[PDB]
Amino acid sequence: KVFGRCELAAAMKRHGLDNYRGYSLGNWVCAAKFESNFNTQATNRNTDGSTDYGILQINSRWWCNDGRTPGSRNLCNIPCSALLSSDITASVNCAKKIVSDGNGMNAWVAWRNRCKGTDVQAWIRGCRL
């Protein structure tokens, strides 16, 4: 599924991501924009052989099982394919664990490089939330 901007913001809010770990909704929408362009089916192979999955590009090196990332963990206790669903529940639940791991949203390098410190409120501008 390719979400609209406000559609995703609403879905994130419905799943308790709004201000989770002190990160406003715009931060989450911005991260999704630059990780996946709001496409739940996005997958990208990393140079090390792990893969990033879904709307928030969650990495099989630590968070989900894809069966082909030797030496990796599955800390969200989920198949990586579950992170590609139209319903964002699994990606949100797993993102909550990631953002709680110590470094906040810096875990998402695209958030750090493209969202951190910017006017992230713009991402929810106009949205009926």
Q: Which residues are catalytic?
A: 35, 52
The CA distance from 76 to 48, in Å, is: 20
User: Which residues sit opposite 124 in a β-bridge?
Assistant: none
CB of 122 to Cl ion, least distance (A): 8
CB of 5 to Cl ion, least distance (A): 4
Q: Which two tokens stand for residue 86?
A: 């139209």
CB of 91 to Cl ion, least distance (A): 18
Helix, strand, coil share (%) of the chain residues, nearest 5: 40, 10, 50
Binding residues for substrate: 101
Where does this chain bind Cl ion (CB under 5 A)?
5, 24, 26, 67, 69, 120-121
Binding residues: 101
Nearer to Cl ion, 30 or 107 (CB): 30
Give the count of beta carbons closer than 10 Å to the beta carbon of residue 9. Answer: 24
Nearer to Cl ion, 26 or 54 (CB): 26
The CA distance from 38 to 22, in Å, is: 22
Ranked by CB distance to Cl ion, the top (closest) residue is 26
Q: Which two tokens stand for residue 43?
A: 């997958």
